[PDB]
Symmetry: D2
Subunit: 293 residues, 4 copies
Amino acid sequence: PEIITPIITPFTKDNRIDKEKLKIHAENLIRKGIDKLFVNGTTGLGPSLSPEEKLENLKAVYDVTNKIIFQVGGLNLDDAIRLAKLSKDFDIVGIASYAPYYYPRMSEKHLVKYFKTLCEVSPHPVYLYNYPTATGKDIDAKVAKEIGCFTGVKDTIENIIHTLDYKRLNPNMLVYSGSDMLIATVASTGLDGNVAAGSNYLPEVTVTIKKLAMERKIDEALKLQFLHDEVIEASRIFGSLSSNYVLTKYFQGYDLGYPRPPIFPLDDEEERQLIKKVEGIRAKLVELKILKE
Amino acid sequence: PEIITPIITPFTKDNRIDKEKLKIHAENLIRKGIDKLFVNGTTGLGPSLSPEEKLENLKAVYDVTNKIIFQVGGLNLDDAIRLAKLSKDFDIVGIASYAPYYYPRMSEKHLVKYFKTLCEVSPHPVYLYNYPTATGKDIDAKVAKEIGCFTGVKDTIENIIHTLDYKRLNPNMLVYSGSDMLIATVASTGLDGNVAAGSNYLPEVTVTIKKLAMERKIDEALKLQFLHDEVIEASRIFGSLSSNYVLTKYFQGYDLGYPRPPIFPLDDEEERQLIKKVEGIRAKLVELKILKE
Amino acid sequence: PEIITPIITPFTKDNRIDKEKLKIHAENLIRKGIDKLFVNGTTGLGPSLSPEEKLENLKAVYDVTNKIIFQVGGLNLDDAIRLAKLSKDFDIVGIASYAPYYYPRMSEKHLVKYFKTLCEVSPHPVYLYNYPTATGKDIDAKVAKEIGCFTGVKDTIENIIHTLDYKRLNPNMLVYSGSDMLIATVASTGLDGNVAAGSNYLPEVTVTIKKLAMERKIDEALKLQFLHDEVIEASRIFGSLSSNYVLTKYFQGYDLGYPRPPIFPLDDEEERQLIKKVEGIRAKLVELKILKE
Amino acid sequence: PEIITPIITPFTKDNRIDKEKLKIHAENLIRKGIDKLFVNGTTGLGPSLSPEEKLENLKAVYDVTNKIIFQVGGLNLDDAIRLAKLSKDFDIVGIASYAPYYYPRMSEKHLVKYFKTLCEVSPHPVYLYNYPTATGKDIDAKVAKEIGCFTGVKDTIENIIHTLDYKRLNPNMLVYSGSDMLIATVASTGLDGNVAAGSNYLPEVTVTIKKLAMERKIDEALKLQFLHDEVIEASRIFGSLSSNYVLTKYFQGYDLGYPRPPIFPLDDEEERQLIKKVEGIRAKLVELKILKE
């Protein structure tokens, strides 16, 4: 199994993508053993990015690595097709899309047509990003099999029965969980790994949970998983997508600038309070020899 | 109370806004007694429009009428602010925003800051568009009172107690329901009207229900309301946002082009089946002299 | 329209029904203008009562009035049939049942069979008690029509579109809301009234809201409804089913003993805090001459 | 880890517990390597049983084995206490309760008081049966820790993160999943076992999945788990609680009588459809030498 980072998009003080900070972060992740980068995902504020910005992200990250899954979806299918075709010139792992968001009660037929359209134009393998809470719909194992053209799926759902069903119905599909709290479990149970937001700021933790689980040291993997859980919980106090910026700077030592409002940056007091919540975990991770003092 | 149409955005065969068809539709709505037009709402595929397109819509409708509420929201707050400021040049009723959609677990503080930021830059009264199922969050009467700057609210929810609470906690606020099925009830219970997607295609019916209820002819209002409900139900069979185009052509006698994929147009057989479901209702409305033949 | 009280079951210190206290309460409600009493409902802790206790309740209340709807449902259909048959000797308004509770995902076929079975043995008109949050299932207007033997329905749901649909699909059916917060609206919009837990402790207020709305005095009805809403909210702080006992003693001046654990009685401090939350409302109600000192 | 069967309660034609069939079934399960029997759970229609019947089940099963966890909960706490106390004469594993069902919006304090009361009177270890969909409330890892007296938990929920959190916050608690579909995963990920309804009819399969997973033959375990999943899905088509009777007859060869209405037995057409869905699987299991005949 693999750990894949849904890489954060750093923004400047005037709300443009900070390409240089993005390259530094991508470089660090690969050097810490992250397998692939998922670009323009939720953690990277994909839905907040224009199609031009989604493409700018791909170009910046491609300067560092070809191990990229390029998320291209949105509510203008013409724009998503254009991004899919533009990716032809990039020797990457694949493209991906979440389901059309916002609109409630979209028919299965329309959801299927959206995805098959992307598959028909794609110059690369296509990955399903399934995220029912964010998009309002579920493209489950049965619907994925109907669509019939996915190389893999990232399933962001707490119900691992649903994630396992992709493998049951689609034995050749790569099946990843979008949970950070399921790294140990996913590795242990025969699935293909995790696309983990928290690997932006603790890539060494996420890779080590996976390694320990693979060695069948499940108790040691769970001890580490549970520490990582506490960091995820702390990130949720003030908003995880904002907090991820603060936590990357704290644990990794470089900054990723600003999020894009309405994902507002933490203020100084919130950042102080969050660091207070994770200080103790950092000390435990240093004692475990996962982080350097 | 008022009937407000969340106006359909007609798209051309090549997926651009058809300004001429939009003007023909807006004219017809105003002529048939609709109070105000809500532009770039769900029914108008607001979330599928770029900021430039949201402005193009405003410009087209504004050639017809000043009686506009201009929806401006989205996931790039700079773009929503720019649209709010640009509205200064238009003599319209107000601007509006739904809550930031897609991202789950957004903090109350960040939600409040989003709306307060728009209120601070707005040259017009600001209306809350509350739609929990579509956006994933609820800006309830309490949060609305804390935000403090709303002239009115459109509440799209399966819970009229929630809608009444805006009136209870904000006595001077205009409070509209986002449901076609609650026109009789809203008028009967002291609320301010309905922002009704079905008024795109049966403005005569929606205005008549409201009139009957204001005359205290509740049985007669209900009988008409219940007929309208059957049309609403028929529109949902193949997807209401797509079906609304077909129904407007059927009842109002002009074309509104296409929706924007992934809100796909109805195919020929779906259109045939939809018309079959409503043709008897059409005959009955013509026999009742609500529709002219 | 009518106000129907889902009458509280008073228990002794040793967890038996206090029949004499129940008779006091029932007499007061009727004398204060409540139209009918719904016995063994949620407010009466019906699911906590044995079949023998359900019958004891009917017998006690029948000593005071025959204006009774007798709730008989449960998870032993033989017991529910027995209670239904036993009611033949009581000249009451009807019997009622909620849907089988606890078990998730029971087929429509099985639900319809449960209700048709009760209808086939019933010596009285049968009323559907639909409460999806409590029972986990929804016997909607369509399923009610398929069952085809209900005289009326009490719909406990905040979605009034759902409640109106019973009238739309079953024009002869009596249709009541299970909400205290919808008395003004129900009365205004052509429905048949409310089965109102809060009418246990403020029957005067519920009857008055209904009267005001009937007289088309919608603003006065709403002002009173909104005051009643604050009492309902206060009751929810420590648990409504428990708080209803404290509130009845406070407003009506006799006690109703104890609830049945795990519906635990409020402690003295909780009772003191609840009283503090409602004493200002009591004062307004006195000044409006709705209550006497 | 363990496999625990929530044993089905067989009823006679006169709606009494069929003790002799119950005994034959319990003997078979123990003989086929089931670890423990969970008596009066959902699968045993516990909510449908009077306290007397709950005791009668315990006594019948105790004739066969002492490896029993005795579920005692319900909405009359005095009855639940009585059952807890009566268990003192039985040398069993533990007692259990689900949370008080039906009533929405019970306070955390009252739920905590319910469970602590049972712990105070229990002569045996106490197990939480957490089933939020059925009971309408969640007793999560934090509330379990607060209660502070559970020896174990059975978590029936679509959220393995939630189950893992009991281990994370209560490291010396036994933590079981209530899912048949997670036997391979539970064993792999360091959890304590599964209380699995499907083990009533395919105890051979459930025990073999667990063994393969323990041997770290995860792919072989998943292969067999995915066949078991197909049987579970089939059982849900017409209602699992009813289908469990038919499937026990079909796979183990003896019958378990009838369920208790409103859990109605499958009709002949439903039984035929159910068999058609599982006979291929039965053939597969015979070929794999998991089932003899």
